Amino acid sequence: QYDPPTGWLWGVRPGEKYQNEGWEGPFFYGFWGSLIVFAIAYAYKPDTSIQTWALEEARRRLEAEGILEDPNPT
Amino acid sequence: NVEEPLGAAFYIAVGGIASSFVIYNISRPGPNGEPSSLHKWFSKISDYKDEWETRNTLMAAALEQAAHDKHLLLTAER
Amino acid sequence: PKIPYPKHVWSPAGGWYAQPANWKQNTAIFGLVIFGITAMVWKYSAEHEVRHKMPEPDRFYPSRYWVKQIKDYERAQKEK
Amino acid sequence: LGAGSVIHAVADNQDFRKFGGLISYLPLTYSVMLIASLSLVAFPFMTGFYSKDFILESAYGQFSFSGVAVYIIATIGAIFTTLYS
Amino acid sequence: PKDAVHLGLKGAAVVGGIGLLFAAVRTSLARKNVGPWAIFTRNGKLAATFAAVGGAYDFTRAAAANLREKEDWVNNGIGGLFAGATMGLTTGRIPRVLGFAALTGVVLATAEYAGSGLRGVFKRDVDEYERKEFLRKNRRRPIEETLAEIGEGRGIKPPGYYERRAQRLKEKYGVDINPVCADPDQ
Amino acid sequence: PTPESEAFLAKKPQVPPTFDGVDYEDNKRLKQAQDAIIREQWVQVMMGRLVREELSKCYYREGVNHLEKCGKLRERYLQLLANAKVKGYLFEQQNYWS
Amino acid sequence: HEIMIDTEFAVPVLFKLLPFIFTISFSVIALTLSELLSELVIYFKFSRFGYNIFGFFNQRFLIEFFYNKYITNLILNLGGQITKI
Amino acid sequence: NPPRIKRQFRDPHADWWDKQERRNFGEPVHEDHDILGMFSPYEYTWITPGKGLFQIGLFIASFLGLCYVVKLTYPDRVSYPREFEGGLERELGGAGAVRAFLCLDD
Amino acid sequence: NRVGDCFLTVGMFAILWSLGNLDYATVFSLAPYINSNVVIIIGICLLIGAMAKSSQVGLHVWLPMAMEGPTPVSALIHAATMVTA
Amino acid sequence: MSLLYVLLIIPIIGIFLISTIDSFYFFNVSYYKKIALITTILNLIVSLIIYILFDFSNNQFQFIQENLDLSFYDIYLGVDGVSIYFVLLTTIIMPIALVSNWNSITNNIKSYLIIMLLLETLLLAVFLVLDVLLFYIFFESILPPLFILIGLFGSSNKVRASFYIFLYTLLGSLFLLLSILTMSSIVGTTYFDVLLKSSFEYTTQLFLFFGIFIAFAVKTPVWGLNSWLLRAHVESPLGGSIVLAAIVLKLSLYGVFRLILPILPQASLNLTYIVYAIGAITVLYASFSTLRTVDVKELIAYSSVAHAAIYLMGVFSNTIQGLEGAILLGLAHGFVSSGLFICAGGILYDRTGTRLIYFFRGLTQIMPLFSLFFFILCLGNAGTPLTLNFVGEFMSLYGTLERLPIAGMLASTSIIFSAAYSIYMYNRIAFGGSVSLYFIDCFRDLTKREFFILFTLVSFTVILGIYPSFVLDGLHYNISSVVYGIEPNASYLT
């Protein structure tokens, strides 16, 4: 035999319900909400890292060698 | 025999994965075309082509000259 | 027998002998979620699995039916 | 896993000093643990035979001091493995 | 070459002369009359203490100079340690002999390296304006100045470093440097 | 060759990577010289990463015969490994040689 | 330093088949020294010499005993010196 | 400070306020109470380390004894080092890597 | 197992120092041409890390203690898979 | 107006609002906490917007504002790659620090909230100013609000703790001040752009190193100078204990990137063996003692001393990997350390009133969620992978090793010793018995507030440990400017 799952999440007994303390709206809609909105906006932030700039040049530098057959024969 | 709801955590985790799949697909710049309008807007607001170099160079010169004046005043012959 | 335990303790892994009355209905829901994203992992893998050798046409190789880097090769070789 | 069924059969005892005669009580358990024991000792023509015994031949096959030395070092290990088995 | 013994008495007399002064002042502030000659009865252990430090400081600071034949900040450190040490022996505690030796030696060493301006700081006798300007606008130094005094290596690999390394390794280990050709071709 | 995109026009250094003949009183020039020094170092290092990638592709392509068919990149990577390293602009900005 | 070809060819036949000989021989003896003779083990477990080597190997070469009092306890006592002194 | 003994050595079967810890409630504690309790390095009480070191040394003596015996009587190699055409020069990495056996000293 | 990972972590540090990466393709393609001494340094650290998880004669004490867990754990992790890492 | 001044003035508006509502309307103390919480989140919003406009490959300082009003002391703000992540971490931590102490602060709530909002403005000014005298002005300005915060809201030994932090910081700083003053005399200013192109004499660099290093050694803190941290991190309220271990400790790590590496290159290279001796001694000594610490708070606090030594050695590596991993380590540490203080000083202490590990045992039986997060938090403190702590630990150890092998080897014993005390503390509290028998009154598990601030902290340390490129990307170009060295064939090109 098995028992049904039990317990008081957040310590709220089955008779009662959870009571808001005052930090919930600011934390969920503000701090967490801003962090999510920041995440999607980060997906559109243009790339500004030194690698992707240097990969482009280094690609050309190795292209003018025996490595990395370039698309155009100039 | 109490029933168990799936619970908000189920939808937060599932919705997070589902939203990530949805957002990532629409974030691509296309096969080979120009980046979408939203990408262009982010570039436009954070343009700063030469804004900071001009402002920074003016500030260093202003504080170079300050230092020369301070040096001339405190090293003045008694 | 069965170990006594507090009924006031909430566990995410269930607790002590936790079997919900709807275990089957929720196992079905979670099994669909697992299958759903496993297929997504399957879709992503088939597109980015890179090989340097092509399997022989007469050989057992179930990868041939989904992975793109050799799926196009079979149709490309079917041109002469 | 075969031993695990032995501990489960008895009241979760794990001491040899409290077992014996269980062959008539655990016929499948004894048979599979006997098969597993012959492969561990490398009884000929069994799964474990083809693998471990070939390391011993390779050790002497390397015609060096260390190889022949550790063929001896491992042949006592083979002897005491049979004894615990 | 200085007379450590002749100097030591002078240092004891000067510092210990101040000891007689505080001994005489402590005598005058005594509530119970004890007599004029009590300066050397109970107050003697103050002037004797002070002259003991002065001789201990001056002799050791002079004696250390003759051992190395160079006058610098360090000579006052050793004299400070022995002046501090001798102030400890009056107390009678091994922690206190070292605690005072630490205090007096570091204080007296610090004022000689810095050249404490109590008697007056050094005179530049040069244009202060050009000393500031020269230090501020000197922005590139020849590489020989850094290399001779931070060394070569540890990420400081100037041009020609590898050839110098080959010669340096040859004289110390006697091995010709020649990395492999890492390629079947050529 | 691959044409430079608008990304590789804004950040492309307009000045040779040297501290020679530069007036440190010109803040813009000193910074541009500092930038150009850094970009050159980063390109040589990213040249290692790219070459490292064909050597990786060659290795799994050849297998047994990688020790005799992938040596062209092994020197090319090893040369870049022994030479390319981001070391900064600060040592050259303070010392001059030859 | 490949030894595959010599292992299959250079090793004498006796050495190749030796572990099988040593396994049958040492397994019947273990059966013979338990339910067939079975005193010799008890004689050995109470022989003064056999008592010590029984406890030397039961206690796992005494390695754990020396690990605790010379490594983990020493690390624990070093901490005590730093916290208190 | 009470005598410094691991709490391993108290009676498991005694009446304890904390049976798991083997301690009574008002019981005085040592300044090393943290590393004297039940959850702490076990104290092996088989033999003194002086004798313990001796017993390990005999095993080292036995192990070295077998080493000497094998060294005195171990067979010579049976086959000549395998000859390799060209010493596997190119396909073992060229002259910049180690080669195989080819007409060298034996 | 962290005492092994210390040497394992240091061994990877030696690989990054001498090669600039630690991908298998880059490490193994270049290995024949690398200094013999750094290979010894790298290999020793790999050996000490492998010694702990395969519970060899130095870092072995954790393995028999691992039997405190349930028996199925002892089969999957401490008999056939994790110790073989 | 610059967004950088918006960062500084928002918490001052909150101070003004909190102190003035009583006049505008017996206001409920719940409103001030909502004002204080909303103020910190608005500040995070500006920081997230600044980071999204930030350029990862620009050498000029960004988001500067023209002044043209030169006084003797002026405040100039700028942000580059190195300072931006320290700015984001202060803005991310401050809302959590307020929510952490939401119910525990019972008296002087205006005072507690006003000091925290003041500390946010002062701490952010440290990473934003563009002058070395400005840097010191704000590094030492936090002393009065921290002194009053500990004595007003601290524990039993609060007076001694508040005296220890102020006096050690004041003393170490006065040595830093004497060095900063000597530089201003030589160059005529301490503005970054002017001062960075100064090349001091080597002998001057040596005496400039000392004093600056004396200061940062007391604020790192290194072993033997760390008595203030154990007194003040433990006695401080949970919110102030979070700020002290997540942000205050990281001012000296960021101060090496402005005051030591770019202007004292030769001295740093020559005196590295002193630093690595202190750092390796610190790792060993700070680890053995925290094995024997019986205060759970003092044990979490003093493990920070052990991690602070690791990224202090990585900041003297002269290696782009060590320098970056040092920032990653100091960034990851401020996540795990914040969570552990919540677990110990907030969750255990508020339920039991005691910090003694003797009274705790087997809390997994009663608190499943606490053991879940407290285990991931102990894995982060032990530098387990899939955690940003591992990446910072791993990268700054490689730099330390590549700079001085033997010092990096000795420093690399923290893989063993940090795991030694993180799991020993875990197995004594969460495990190691059924439930402590000194608990005559059964406990409640994590509340929603306790669950969210912990879940947020383990989220940052895990996402950034699976994709550390979020921080590493904007950090690569600017740390390239703080390395000292050249190649024999990649320098002086013509």
Q: What secondary structure, in 3-state letters, does I11-22 show?
A: HHHHHHHHHCCC
Q: How far is Cα J491 from Cα J494, in angstroms, rounded to an integer?
A: 9
Scan residues 19-78 of G and list those with Cβ closer than 8 Å to I: 60, 63-64, 67
Q: Give the count of beta carbons closer than 10 Å to the beta carbon of residue A58.
A: 24
**Helix (H), strand (E) at residue E142:** strand E141-142
| DSSP three-state, residue E88 | helix
Closest to H86 in 3D by CA, of H71, H65, H101: H101
J407: which residues sit within 8 A by CB, 6+ positions away?
J273, J276, J277, J279, J280, J313, J400, J401
3-state secondary structure E143-180: HHHHHHHHCCECCECCCCHHHHHHHHHHHHHCCCCCCC
Q: How far is Cα J343 from Cα J296, in angstroms, rounded to an integer?
A: 10
Tokens of J422: 């993180």
Q: What is the largest CA-CA distance in chain H?
A: 85
Looking at residue J129, the DSSP 8-state letter turns out to be B
Q: How far is Cα C62 from Cα C77, in angstroms, rounded to an integer?
A: 18
For residue C55, the distance in angstroms to the closest alpha carbon of chain A comes to 26
Closest to J4 in 3D by CA, of J65, J61, J58: J65
Q: Does D23 touch chain H (CB under 8 A)?
A: no
| DSSP three-state, residue F23 | coil
Tokens of C66: 């989904």
DSSP sequence for J94-120: HHHHHHHTTTT--S-HHHHHHHHHHHH
Q: Is G80 exposed, middle or buried (0-12, 13-18, 19+ CB in 10 A)?
A: middle
Q: How far is Cα H50 from Cα H69, in angstroms, rounded to an integer?
A: 29
Instruction: Measure the N-to-C terminal CA separation of chain H; round to a whole number of Å.
Output: 74
Q: How far is Cα J114 from Cα J12, in angstroms, rounded to an integer?
A: 9
Q: How far is Cα J57 from Cα J475, in angstroms, rounded to an integer?
A: 9
Length of chain J (residues) = 494
Assign residue C32 a region (left: φ > 0; alpha: ψ between -120 and 50; beta: otherwise): alpha
| DSSP three-state, residue J315 | coil
Closest to J283 in 3D by CA, of J308, J301, J300: J308
> Do J144 and J153 meet the contact criterion of CB atoms below 8 Å apart?
no
Look-up of token digits 């190997």? G57
DSSP sequence for J413-446: THHHHHHHHHHHHHHHHTSSSSS-TT--SPPP--
Distances (CA, A) of J9 to J42, J85, J97: 11, 20, 19
Length of chain G (residues) = 85
Q: How far is Cα J406 from Cα I18, in angstroms, rounded to an integer?
A: 17
Q: Does F44 touch chain A (CB under 8 A)?
A: yes
Counting as contact any 3 or more CB pairs under 8 A, the partners of D are G, H, I
Establish, for the pair of chains B and J, how many residue pairs have beta carbons separated by less than 8 Å: 53
Tokens of E108: 């007296």
Distances (CA, A) of C73 to C51, C52, C67, F59, H61: 11, 12, 10, 22, 67
Closest to B23 in 3D by CA, of E166, G51, A40: A40
Assign residue C59 a region (left: φ > 0; alpha: ψ between -120 and 50; beta: otherwise): beta
> Do J223 and J149 meet the contact criterion of CB atoms below 8 Å apart?
no
> Do J490 and F84 meet the contact criterion of CB atoms below 8 Å apart?
yes
Is the four-CA dihedral E13, E14, E16, E22 of positive or negative sign?
positive
> Do H55 and G62 meet the contact criterion of CB atoms below 8 Å apart?
yes
Q: How far is Cα J53 from Cα J123, in angstroms, rounded to an integer?
A: 22
Q: Does H95 touch chain F (CB under 8 A)?
A: no
> Do J327 and J343 meet the contact criterion of CB atoms below 8 Å apart?
no
Which residues of chain I are at the G interface, by a Cβ-Cβ cutoff of 8 Å? 60-61, 64
Angle between helix E4-28 and helix E44-68 axes, rounded to 10 deg: 160
J218: which residues sit within 8 A by CB, 6+ positions away?
J168, J169, J171, J172, J225, J228
Is the four-CA dihedral H78, H80, H84, H85 of positive or negative sign?
negative
Q: How far is Cα J61 from Cα J78, in angstroms, rounded to an integer?
A: 5
Contacts of C8 in chain J (CB under 8 A): 442
Please give the residue range of the domain that contains residue E78.
1-116
Closest to J398 in 3D by CA, of J490, J318, J282: J318
Q: How far is Cα J281 from Cα E24, in angstroms, rounded to an integer?
A: 53
Tokens of I46: 């790999």
Establish, for the pair of chains A and J, how many residue pairs have beta carbons separated by less than 8 Å: 71
Q: Which long-range contacts (CB under 8 A, 24 or more apart) does E100-105 make?
A: E104/E80, E105/E77, E105/E78, E105/E79, E105/E80, E105/E81
Nearest chain D residue to H63 by CA distance is: D73
Tokens of H28: 């005085």
Is the four-CA dihedral H33, H38, H39, H42 of positive or negative sign?
positive
Residue J75 has phi, psi (to 5 degrees) of: -105, 115
E116: which residues sit within 8 A by CB, 6+ positions away?
none
Q: How far is Cα D25 from Cα D19, in angstroms, rounded to an integer?
A: 11
E179: which residues sit within 8 A by CB, 6+ positions away?
none
Contacts of C12 in chain J (CB under 8 A): 368-369, 372
Q: Which residues pair with E153 in a beta bridge?
A: E156
Q: How far is Cα J275 from Cα A46, in angstroms, rounded to an integer?
A: 40
Strands F95-96 and E141-142: parallel
Q: How far is Cα H69 from Cα D69, in angstroms, rounded to an integer?
A: 9
Contacts of E133 in chain B (CB under 8 A): 71
Give the ranges where H1-106 is alpha helix by DSSP (H). Answer: 49-72
Question: Cα Rg for chain C, rounded, in angstroms?
Answer: 23
Tokens of D22: 């269980």
Q: How far is Cα E78 from Cα E62, in angstroms, rounded to an integer?
A: 10
Nearest chain J residue to G85 by CA distance is: J289
Q: How far is Cα J236 from Cα J153, in angstroms, rounded to an integer?
A: 7
Q: Does C26 touch chain A (CB under 8 A)?
A: no
Closest to J388 in 3D by CA, of J437, J443, J475, J459: J459
Q: What is the largest CA-CA distance in chain J?
A: 80
Question: Cα Rg for chain G, rounded, in angstroms?
Answer: 24
Residue J356 has phi, psi (to 5 degrees) of: -80, 125
Q: Which residues pair with F95 in a beta bridge?
A: E141
Q: How far is Cα J253 from Cα J221, in angstroms, rounded to an integer?
A: 11
Distances (CA, A) of J140 to J73, J133, J226: 16, 11, 18
Are C20 and A8 in contact (CB < 8 Å)? no
In the structure, how many helices (H) and strands (E) does chain G have? 6, 0
Q: What is the largest CA-CA distance in chain B?
A: 98
Contacts of E126 in chain B (CB under 8 A): none
> Do H37 and H16 meet the contact criterion of CB atoms below 8 Å apart?
no
**Helix (H), strand (E) at residue I51:** helix I36-53
> Do J363 and J429 meet the contact criterion of CB atoms below 8 Å apart?
yes
Amino acid at E64: A
Partner residue facing H35 (CB), from G6, G61, G76:
G76
> Do E129 and B75 meet the contact criterion of CB atoms below 8 Å apart?
yes
Distances (CA, A) of D32 to D6, D38, E132, J392: 12, 10, 91, 50
Q: How far is Cα D56 from Cα A53, in angstroms, rounded to an integer?
A: 57
Q: How far is Cα J319 from Cα J479, in angstroms, rounded to an integer?
A: 10
**Helix (H), strand (E) at residue F95:** strand F95-96
**Helix (H), strand (E) at residue F96:** strand F95-96
Which residues of chain D are at the I interface, by a Cβ-Cβ cutoff of 8 Å? 1, 3-4, 7
Q: How far is Cα E166 from Cα E177, in angstroms, rounded to an integer?
A: 6
Looking at residue J222, the DSSP 8-state letter turns out to be P
> Do C20 and C26 meet the contact criterion of CB atoms below 8 Å apart?
yes
